[PDB]
CSV table of C-alpha atoms in Angstrom, one decimal:
chain,number,residue,atom,x,y,z
A,157,UNK,CA,29.7,23.2,27.5
A,158,UNK,CA,32.3,23.0,24.8
A,159,UNK,CA,34.3,20.4,26.8
A,160,UNK,CA,31.2,18.4,27.3
A,161,UNK,CA,30.5,18.5,23.6
A,162,UNK,CA,34.0,17.3,22.7
A,163,UNK,CA,33.6,14.4,25.2
A,164,UNK,CA,30.3,13.5,23.5
A,165,UNK,CA,32.1,13.6,20.1
A,166,UNK,CA,34.8,11.3,21.5
A,167,UNK,CA,32.2,8.9,22.8
A,168,UNK,CA,30.5,8.9,19.4
A,169,UNK,CA,33.8,8.2,17.7
A,170,UNK,CA,34.4,5.3,20.1
A,171,UNK,CA,31.0,3.8,19.4
A,172,UNK,CA,31.6,4.1,15.7
A,173,UNK,CA,34.9,2.3,16.1
A,174,UNK,CA,33.5,-0.6,18.1
A,175,UNK,CA,30.0,-1.2,16.5
A,176,UNK,CA,32.2,-2.6,13.6
A,177,UNK,CA,30.6,-6.0,14.3
A,178,UNK,CA,27.1,-6.9,15.4
A,179,UNK,CA,27.1,-10.6,16.0
A,180,UNK,CA,26.1,-11.3,19.6
A,181,UNK,CA,27.6,-8.9,22.1
A,182,UNK,CA,28.8,-6.0,20.0
A,183,UNK,CA,25.5,-4.1,20.1
A,184,UNK,CA,23.9,-4.6,23.5
A,185,UNK,CA,26.8,-3.2,25.5
A,186,UNK,CA,26.8,0.0,23.5
A,187,UNK,CA,23.0,0.1,23.8
A,188,UNK,CA,23.3,0.1,27.6
A,189,UNK,CA,26.0,2.8,27.2
A,190,UNK,CA,23.6,4.9,25.1
A,191,UNK,CA,21.2,4.4,28.0
A,192,UNK,CA,23.8,6.0,30.3
A,193,UNK,CA,24.4,8.8,27.7
A,194,UNK,CA,20.7,9.6,27.7
A,195,UNK,CA,20.9,9.5,31.5
A,196,UNK,CA,23.6,12.2,31.6
A,197,UNK,CA,22.4,15.1,29.6
A,198,UNK,CA,18.9,15.1,31.2
A,199,UNK,CA,20.4,17.2,34.1
A,216,UNK,CA,19.4,28.6,21.5
A,217,UNK,CA,18.9,25.0,20.3
A,218,UNK,CA,19.7,25.9,16.7
A,219,UNK,CA,23.4,25.6,17.3
A,220,UNK,CA,22.8,22.3,19.1
A,221,UNK,CA,20.9,21.0,16.1
A,222,UNK,CA,23.6,22.1,13.8
A,223,UNK,CA,26.3,20.4,15.9
A,224,UNK,CA,24.3,17.1,16.1
A,225,UNK,CA,23.7,17.2,12.3
A,226,UNK,CA,27.5,17.8,11.9
A,227,UNK,CA,28.0,14.6,14.0
A,228,UNK,CA,25.6,12.7,11.7
A,229,UNK,CA,27.3,14.1,8.6
A,230,UNK,CA,30.7,12.9,10.1
A,231,UNK,CA,29.5,9.4,11.1
A,232,UNK,CA,27.5,8.6,7.9
A,233,UNK,CA,29.8,10.1,5.2
A,234,UNK,CA,32.0,7.0,5.2
A,235,UNK,CA,29.0,5.2,3.7
A,236,UNK,CA,27.3,7.7,1.3
A,248,UNK,CA,34.9,0.7,7.0
A,249,UNK,CA,33.5,-2.8,7.6
A,250,UNK,CA,30.1,-1.2,8.4
A,251,UNK,CA,28.5,-1.9,5.1
A,252,UNK,CA,24.9,-3.0,5.9
A,253,UNK,CA,23.1,0.3,5.5
A,254,UNK,CA,20.0,-1.1,7.2
A,255,UNK,CA,21.9,-1.2,10.6
A,256,UNK,CA,23.5,2.2,10.3
A,257,UNK,CA,20.0,3.5,9.7
A,258,UNK,CA,18.7,1.9,12.9
A,259,UNK,CA,21.6,3.1,15.0
A,260,UNK,CA,21.2,6.6,13.6
A,261,UNK,CA,17.4,6.7,14.2
A,262,UNK,CA,17.8,5.4,17.7
A,263,UNK,CA,20.4,8.0,18.5
A,264,UNK,CA,18.2,10.8,17.1
A,265,UNK,CA,14.9,9.7,18.6
A,266,UNK,CA,16.0,8.4,22.0
A,267,UNK,CA,18.0,11.6,23.0
A,268,UNK,CA,14.9,13.4,21.5
A,269,UNK,CA,17.3,15.6,19.4
A,270,UNK,CA,15.4,15.3,16.2
A,271,UNK,CA,17.4,15.4,12.9
A,272,UNK,CA,16.0,18.1,10.7
A,273,UNK,CA,18.1,17.9,7.5
A,274,UNK,CA,18.3,15.6,4.5
A,275,UNK,CA,16.0,12.7,5.4
A,276,UNK,CA,16.9,11.3,2.0
A,277,UNK,CA,20.3,10.0,3.1
A,278,UNK,CA,18.9,8.2,6.2
A,279,UNK,CA,15.9,6.8,4.3
A,280,UNK,CA,18.3,5.5,1.6
A,281,UNK,CA,20.2,3.8,4.4
A,282,UNK,CA,17.0,2.0,5.5
A,283,UNK,CA,16.3,1.2,1.8
A,284,UNK,CA,17.1,-2.5,1.8
A,285,UNK,CA,18.4,-4.2,-1.3
A,286,UNK,CA,17.5,-7.7,-0.2
A,287,UNK,CA,16.8,-10.2,-3.0
A,288,UNK,CA,16.3,-13.5,-1.2
A,289,UNK,CA,13.9,-14.2,1.8
A,290,UNK,CA,16.6,-15.9,3.8
A,291,UNK,CA,19.0,-13.1,2.8
A,292,UNK,CA,16.3,-10.6,3.7
A,293,UNK,CA,16.1,-12.1,7.2
A,294,UNK,CA,19.9,-12.4,7.8
A,295,UNK,CA,20.4,-8.8,6.5
A,296,UNK,CA,19.1,-7.6,9.9
A,297,UNK,CA,19.1,-10.9,11.9
A,298,UNK,CA,19.2,-8.7,15.1
A,299,UNK,CA,16.0,-6.6,15.3
A,300,UNK,CA,14.5,-9.5,17.3
A,301,UNK,CA,17.3,-9.5,19.8
A,302,UNK,CA,16.7,-5.8,20.5
A,303,UNK,CA,13.3,-5.4,22.4
A,304,UNK,CA,13.0,-1.7,22.0
A,305,UNK,CA,10.1,0.5,20.7
A,306,UNK,CA,11.4,0.8,17.2
A,307,UNK,CA,7.8,1.1,15.9
A,308,UNK,CA,7.4,4.5,17.5
A,309,UNK,CA,10.4,6.0,15.8
A,310,UNK,CA,9.5,4.3,12.5
A,311,UNK,CA,6.1,5.9,12.6
A,312,UNK,CA,7.7,9.2,13.5
A,313,UNK,CA,9.9,9.1,10.5
A,314,UNK,CA,6.9,8.2,8.3
A,315,UNK,CA,5.1,11.2,9.8
A,316,UNK,CA,8.2,13.3,8.9
A,317,UNK,CA,7.9,11.8,5.4
A,318,UNK,CA,4.5,13.3,5.2
A,319,UNK,CA,5.8,16.7,6.4
A,320,UNK,CA,8.8,16.7,4.0
A,321,UNK,CA,6.6,16.0,0.9
A,322,UNK,CA,9.0,13.2,-0.1
A,323,UNK,CA,8.6,9.6,-1.3
A,324,UNK,CA,11.8,7.9,-0.1
A,325,UNK,CA,9.9,6.0,2.7
A,326,UNK,CA,8.8,3.5,0.0
A,327,UNK,CA,12.2,1.9,0.2
A,328,UNK,CA,11.8,2.2,4.0
A,329,UNK,CA,8.4,0.4,3.8
A,330,UNK,CA,10.0,-3.1,4.0
A,331,UNK,CA,11.8,-2.2,7.2
A,332,UNK,CA,8.5,-1.1,8.7
A,333,UNK,CA,7.2,-4.6,7.8
A,334,UNK,CA,10.4,-5.8,9.5
A,335,UNK,CA,9.2,-4.2,12.8
A,336,UNK,CA,5.4,-4.2,12.4
A,337,UNK,CA,3.4,-7.2,13.6
A,338,UNK,CA,4.3,-9.7,10.9
A,339,UNK,CA,0.9,-11.4,11.0
A,340,UNK,CA,-1.4,-12.5,8.2
A,341,UNK,CA,-5.1,-11.8,7.7
A,342,UNK,CA,-8.1,-14.0,8.8
A,343,UNK,CA,-9.1,-14.2,5.0
A,344,UNK,CA,-12.2,-12.0,5.8
A,345,UNK,CA,-10.3,-9.0,4.7
A,346,UNK,CA,-13.3,-6.9,3.7
A,347,UNK,CA,-14.3,-6.7,7.4
A,348,UNK,CA,-11.0,-5.2,8.6
A,349,UNK,CA,-10.2,-1.5,8.1
A,350,UNK,CA,-7.6,-0.3,5.7
A,351,UNK,CA,-5.0,0.6,8.4
A,352,UNK,CA,-4.8,-2.9,9.8
A,353,UNK,CA,-5.0,-4.3,6.2
A,354,UNK,CA,-2.1,-2.3,4.7
A,355,UNK,CA,0.1,-2.9,7.8
A,356,UNK,CA,0.2,0.9,8.4
A,357,UNK,CA,-1.6,0.9,11.8
A,358,UNK,CA,-1.2,3.9,14.0
A,359,UNK,CA,0.4,6.0,11.3
A,360,UNK,CA,-1.8,8.8,10.1
A,361,UNK,CA,-3.0,7.2,6.9
A,362,UNK,CA,-3.4,9.2,3.6
A,363,UNK,CA,-3.4,12.9,4.7
A,364,UNK,CA,-0.4,13.9,2.7
A,365,UNK,CA,-1.0,13.1,-1.0
A,366,UNK,CA,-3.7,15.8,-1.2
A,367,UNK,CA,-3.0,18.0,-4.3
A,368,UNK,CA,0.4,16.8,-5.2
A,369,UNK,CA,-0.7,15.5,-8.6
A,370,UNK,CA,3.0,15.3,-9.7
A,371,UNK,CA,2.9,11.7,-8.6
A,372,UNK,CA,4.9,10.7,-11.7
A,373,UNK,CA,8.1,11.2,-9.7
A,374,UNK,CA,7.1,8.6,-7.1
A,375,UNK,CA,5.7,6.3,-9.7
A,376,UNK,CA,9.0,6.3,-11.5
A,377,UNK,CA,10.6,5.9,-8.1
A,378,UNK,CA,8.7,2.6,-7.8
A,379,UNK,CA,9.3,1.7,-11.5
A,380,UNK,CA,12.9,0.5,-10.8
A,381,UNK,CA,12.0,-1.4,-7.6
A,382,UNK,CA,10.6,-4.7,-8.9
A,383,UNK,CA,13.5,-6.2,-6.9
A,384,UNK,CA,12.1,-4.5,-3.8
A,385,UNK,CA,8.7,-5.8,-4.7
A,386,UNK,CA,9.9,-9.4,-5.0
A,387,UNK,CA,11.2,-9.4,-1.4
A,388,UNK,CA,8.4,-7.9,0.6
A,389,UNK,CA,4.9,-9.4,-0.1
A,390,UNK,CA,2.8,-6.8,1.8
A,391,UNK,CA,4.9,-4.0,0.1
A,392,UNK,CA,2.8,-4.1,-3.1
A,393,UNK,CA,-0.4,-4.2,-1.0
A,394,UNK,CA,0.7,-1.1,0.8
A,395,UNK,CA,1.7,0.7,-2.4
A,396,UNK,CA,-1.8,0.0,-3.7
A,397,UNK,CA,-3.2,1.2,-0.4
A,398,UNK,CA,-1.7,4.7,-0.9
A,399,UNK,CA,-4.2,7.0,-2.6
A,400,UNK,CA,-3.3,8.1,-6.2
A,401,UNK,CA,-6.9,8.1,-7.2
A,402,UNK,CA,-6.6,9.4,-10.8
A,403,UNK,CA,-3.1,7.8,-11.0
A,404,UNK,CA,-4.2,4.3,-9.7
A,405,UNK,CA,-4.9,3.3,-13.3
A,406,UNK,CA,-1.4,3.3,-14.6
A,407,UNK,CA,0.1,1.8,-11.5
A,408,UNK,CA,-1.8,-1.5,-11.9
A,409,UNK,CA,-0.2,-2.2,-15.3
A,410,UNK,CA,3.2,-0.6,-14.5
A,411,UNK,CA,4.3,-3.7,-12.6
A,412,UNK,CA,2.2,-6.1,-14.6
A,413,UNK,CA,5.3,-8.4,-14.7
A,414,UNK,CA,5.3,-8.2,-10.9
A,415,UNK,CA,1.7,-9.4,-11.0
A,416,UNK,CA,2.8,-12.2,-13.4
A,417,UNK,CA,5.6,-13.5,-11.1
A,418,UNK,CA,3.3,-13.2,-8.1
A,419,UNK,CA,-0.3,-14.1,-9.2
A,420,UNK,CA,-1.8,-13.7,-5.8
A,421,UNK,CA,-1.6,-9.9,-5.4
A,422,UNK,CA,-4.3,-9.2,-8.0
A,423,UNK,CA,-7.0,-10.2,-5.5
A,424,UNK,CA,-5.8,-7.7,-2.9
A,425,UNK,CA,-6.0,-5.1,-5.7
A,426,UNK,CA,-9.8,-5.4,-5.6
A,427,UNK,CA,-9.6,-5.1,-1.8
A,428,UNK,CA,-7.9,-1.8,-2.4
A,429,UNK,CA,-10.6,-0.7,-4.8
A,430,UNK,CA,-13.1,-1.8,-2.1
A,431,UNK,CA,-11.4,0.7,0.3
A,432,UNK,CA,-11.9,3.3,-2.4
A,433,UNK,CA,-15.6,2.8,-2.6
A,434,UNK,CA,-16.6,6.2,-1.1
A,435,UNK,CA,-14.3,8.1,-3.3
A,436,UNK,CA,-15.7,6.3,-6.4
A,437,UNK,CA,-19.1,7.7,-5.6
A,438,UNK,CA,-17.4,11.1,-5.5
A,439,UNK,CA,-16.1,10.7,-9.0
A,440,UNK,CA,-19.2,8.8,-10.0
A,441,UNK,CA,-21.1,11.9,-8.7
A,442,UNK,CA,-19.2,14.1,-11.1
A,443,UNK,CA,-20.3,12.2,-14.3
A,444,UNK,CA,-17.4,13.8,-16.2
A,445,UNK,CA,-16.4,11.8,-19.3
A,446,UNK,CA,-12.7,11.6,-18.3
A,447,UNK,CA,-13.4,11.1,-14.6
A,448,UNK,CA,-15.8,8.3,-15.3
A,449,UNK,CA,-13.5,6.9,-18.0
A,450,UNK,CA,-10.8,6.5,-15.3
A,451,UNK,CA,-13.1,4.1,-13.4
A,452,UNK,CA,-14.1,2.5,-16.8
A,453,UNK,CA,-10.6,1.5,-17.8
A,454,UNK,CA,-9.7,0.7,-14.2
A,455,UNK,CA,-12.5,-1.9,-14.3
A,456,UNK,CA,-11.5,-3.1,-17.8
A,457,UNK,CA,-7.8,-3.6,-16.9
A,458,UNK,CA,-8.8,-5.3,-13.6
A,459,UNK,CA,-11.0,-7.6,-15.8
A,460,UNK,CA,-8.0,-8.3,-18.0
A,461,UNK,CA,-5.6,-9.1,-15.1
A,462,UNK,CA,-8.3,-11.4,-13.7
A,463,UNK,CA,-9.2,-13.3,-16.8
A,464,UNK,CA,-5.7,-13.7,-18.2
A,465,UNK,CA,-4.3,-14.9,-14.9
A,466,UNK,CA,-7.2,-17.3,-14.0
A,467,UNK,CA,-5.0,-20.5,-13.9
A,468,UNK,CA,-2.2,-19.2,-11.8
A,469,UNK,CA,-4.3,-17.9,-8.9
A,470,UNK,CA,-3.5,-19.9,-5.7
A,471,UNK,CA,-6.4,-22.0,-4.5
A,472,UNK,CA,-5.8,-21.2,-0.9
A,473,UNK,CA,-5.8,-17.4,-1.7
A,474,UNK,CA,-9.4,-17.8,-2.7
A,475,UNK,CA,-12.0,-17.5,0.1
A,476,UNK,CA,-15.8,-16.9,0.3
A,477,UNK,CA,-15.0,-13.3,1.3
A,478,UNK,CA,-13.9,-11.6,-1.9
A,479,UNK,CA,-17.4,-12.3,-3.3
A,480,UNK,CA,-18.8,-9.8,-0.8
A,481,UNK,CA,-16.0,-7.4,-2.0
A,482,UNK,CA,-17.3,-7.6,-5.6
A,483,UNK,CA,-20.9,-7.5,-4.5
A,484,UNK,CA,-20.3,-4.3,-2.6
A,485,UNK,CA,-18.2,-2.8,-5.4
A,486,UNK,CA,-20.9,-3.6,-8.0
A,487,UNK,CA,-23.7,-2.3,-5.8
A,488,UNK,CA,-21.7,0.9,-5.2
A,489,UNK,CA,-21.1,1.3,-9.0
A,490,UNK,CA,-24.8,0.7,-9.8
A,491,UNK,CA,-25.9,3.4,-7.3
A,492,UNK,CA,-24.3,6.6,-8.7
A,493,UNK,CA,-24.4,6.0,-12.5
A,494,UNK,CA,-27.7,7.8,-12.8
A,495,UNK,CA,-27.5,8.1,-16.6
A,496,UNK,CA,-27.8,5.9,-19.7
A,497,UNK,CA,-24.6,6.6,-21.6
A,498,UNK,CA,-22.6,5.1,-18.7
A,499,UNK,CA,-24.1,1.6,-19.3
A,500,UNK,CA,-20.6,0.2,-19.5
A,501,UNK,CA,-19.8,0.6,-15.8
A,502,UNK,CA,-22.6,-1.7,-14.5
A,503,UNK,CA,-21.7,-4.2,-17.3
A,504,UNK,CA,-18.1,-4.1,-16.3
A,505,UNK,CA,-18.9,-4.6,-12.6
A,506,UNK,CA,-21.2,-7.5,-13.5
A,507,UNK,CA,-18.3,-9.0,-15.6
A,508,UNK,CA,-15.9,-8.6,-12.7
A,509,UNK,CA,-18.3,-10.3,-10.2
A,510,UNK,CA,-19.1,-13.0,-12.7
A,511,UNK,CA,-15.3,-13.6,-13.2
A,512,UNK,CA,-14.8,-14.2,-9.5
A,513,UNK,CA,-18.0,-16.3,-9.1
A,514,UNK,CA,-16.7,-18.5,-11.9
A,515,UNK,CA,-13.3,-18.5,-10.2
A,516,UNK,CA,-14.7,-19.4,-6.8
A,517,UNK,CA,-16.6,-22.2,-8.4
A,518,UNK,CA,-13.3,-24.1,-8.8
A,519,UNK,CA,-12.9,-23.8,-5.0
A,520,UNK,CA,-16.5,-24.3,-3.8
A,521,UNK,CA,-17.3,-27.3,-6.0
A,522,UNK,CA,-13.9,-28.8,-6.9
A,523,UNK,CA,-11.6,-29.9,-4.1
A,524,UNK,CA,-12.7,-27.8,-1.2
A,525,UNK,CA,-16.4,-28.8,-0.9
A,526,UNK,CA,-17.9,-26.7,1.9
A,527,UNK,CA,-21.2,-25.2,3.2
A,528,UNK,CA,-19.7,-21.7,2.9
A,529,UNK,CA,-20.1,-21.9,-0.9
A,530,UNK,CA,-23.5,-22.4,-2.5
A,531,UNK,CA,-25.1,-19.9,-0.1
A,532,UNK,CA,-22.7,-17.0,0.2
A,533,UNK,CA,-22.7,-17.5,-3.6
A,534,UNK,CA,-26.5,-17.6,-4.0
A,535,UNK,CA,-26.7,-14.5,-1.9
A,536,UNK,CA,-24.0,-12.7,-3.9
A,537,UNK,CA,-25.7,-13.6,-7.2
A,538,UNK,CA,-29.1,-12.4,-5.9
A,539,UNK,CA,-27.6,-9.1,-4.7
A,540,UNK,CA,-25.8,-8.6,-8.0
A,541,UNK,CA,-29.0,-9.3,-10.0
A,542,UNK,CA,-31.1,-7.1,-7.7
A,543,UNK,CA,-28.6,-4.2,-8.0
A,544,UNK,CA,-28.5,-4.6,-11.8
A,545,UNK,CA,-32.3,-4.6,-12.1
A,546,UNK,CA,-32.6,-1.6,-9.7
A,547,UNK,CA,-30.2,0.3,-11.9
A,548,UNK,CA,-32.1,-0.6,-15.0
A,549,UNK,CA,-35.4,0.6,-13.4
A,550,UNK,CA,-33.6,3.8,-12.3
A,551,UNK,CA,-32.4,4.6,-15.8
A,552,UNK,CA,-35.4,3.4,-17.9
A,553,UNK,CA,-38.1,5.8,-16.8
A,554,UNK,CA,-40.1,6.2,-20.0
A,555,UNK,CA,-41.6,3.6,-22.3
A,556,UNK,CA,-39.5,1.9,-25.0
A,557,UNK,CA,-42.0,3.0,-27.7
A,558,UNK,CA,-42.5,6.8,-28.2
A,559,UNK,CA,-46.3,7.2,-28.7
A,560,UNK,CA,-46.1,6.1,-32.3
A,561,UNK,CA,-44.9,2.5,-32.1
A,562,UNK,CA,-42.2,3.2,-34.7
A,563,UNK,CA,-38.9,4.2,-33.0
A,564,UNK,CA,-37.5,3.6,-29.6
A,565,UNK,CA,-37.6,6.4,-27.0
A,566,UNK,CA,-34.1,5.4,-25.8
A,567,UNK,CA,-31.6,5.2,-28.7
A,568,UNK,CA,-29.3,2.9,-26.7
A,569,UNK,CA,-31.9,0.7,-25.0
A,570,UNK,CA,-31.5,-2.3,-27.2
A,571,UNK,CA,-27.7,-2.0,-27.1
A,572,UNK,CA,-27.9,-1.8,-23.3
A,573,UNK,CA,-30.1,-4.9,-23.1
A,574,UNK,CA,-27.8,-6.8,-25.4
A,575,UNK,CA,-24.8,-5.9,-23.4
A,576,UNK,CA,-26.4,-6.8,-20.1
A,577,UNK,CA,-28.0,-10.1,-20.9
A,578,UNK,CA,-24.7,-11.5,-22.5
A,579,UNK,CA,-22.6,-11.2,-19.4
C-alpha cells in the first residue's frame, strides 16, 4: 500500500516535470499515461483523501517553474481529480483562481488555451460538477471560472428569437442546475464587489455579462445594472439582453407585484426607470443587426405582466414606465423596419405589439377605475389621482 503510494507520487512528480511544455506532443502522451494510471488502481478513505490533497498541495504550491498559464494547471488538476473519481474536498478557491483567466485580447484569449480543441474529452461534465460544488460550498469564485465554461460549452449564437428559448440555453448554463443556490444568501454584496473589479474579465467574454445578469439577485439586480454602466458604454449591445433577463424574471415580478409593498414595488420602479435611461441614452450606439422583431414581443409580455398585478391606483407609475419602455423599443425598431432593412416582419409584428400594449393599458385602466369620476355632487373627483394618471398615460 505505502509502496504503491510512493510509486504514484513519483509518477506525479514525473508528469509535473514533463508537462512543462504543451505545444503538440507534450500533453497527449501523458494523457494516455493517465489512462493507464486510471486502469491500474481499479483492481477508511479519509486518509486517501488527505494524501491526494497533499499531492495537490505539493503540485500547485509552486504557482500560488515554466508552468505559468494557470488555466492549464487548472484543467490538468480537475482532470486528475474527476477522472480517478477521487474528488478534491478542500479549498476550491485555489483551483477556481487557477481557472480564472486574465485574458484581455480575443486572440490572446484563444491562444491562452489553444489546446482544449485538441483534447476531445468530456471536460463539460467536470466543469458542471465543479459548478455544482460551487453551489454546495456557498462560494462565488466560479464567476472567474465562467469564461472557461464558455470555452468548453457549445460556442454557438442564438437564432435572434431569444424569447422563445429557455433561460438555460440562453445563459449558456445548460445541464447545470440553474438558480437553486442563491436562496436566502442576501449578503450578495460580497459577490457584487467580486465582479466590481472584473470589467477586464467582462471585456473578454461576451456571454459572461449575460450569464451574470441571468443569476438571480432579485432585490440586488437594480444596483448591478448601473455598477458596470461603463461596461455597457463600451459594449452597447448587452443592454437588449438585459430586458431578456427581466423577461425571464416575469413570474417573480408578479410575486413582488403581488406584495404591493412600497419598497418591493419601488425596486421594480427604479429598475424600469434605469432600464429606460440606459435605453434612451444609448439609442445611437445600438447595433442595427442586434435589433430583431423579437424583442418587441419581450416588451409586450413584460408590459402585459406589469399591467396584470398592479391592482391599485397609487402604482400608476409602473404601467407608465412599461409603456415608455415598449415605446422606446418601437421607436428604436422603427429605424430597422423602415430605414435600411425593409421587411414584411415589421409593420405587422409591430401593429400587433402596439395593439397588445394599448389593450393591456386600457384593461388596467378599467380594472383600477371602478367608480365614476364625479362623486354624486359634480364638484370633486372621486379619485384624487385620476387626472394625473390620465395626463401621465396619454403623454407617453
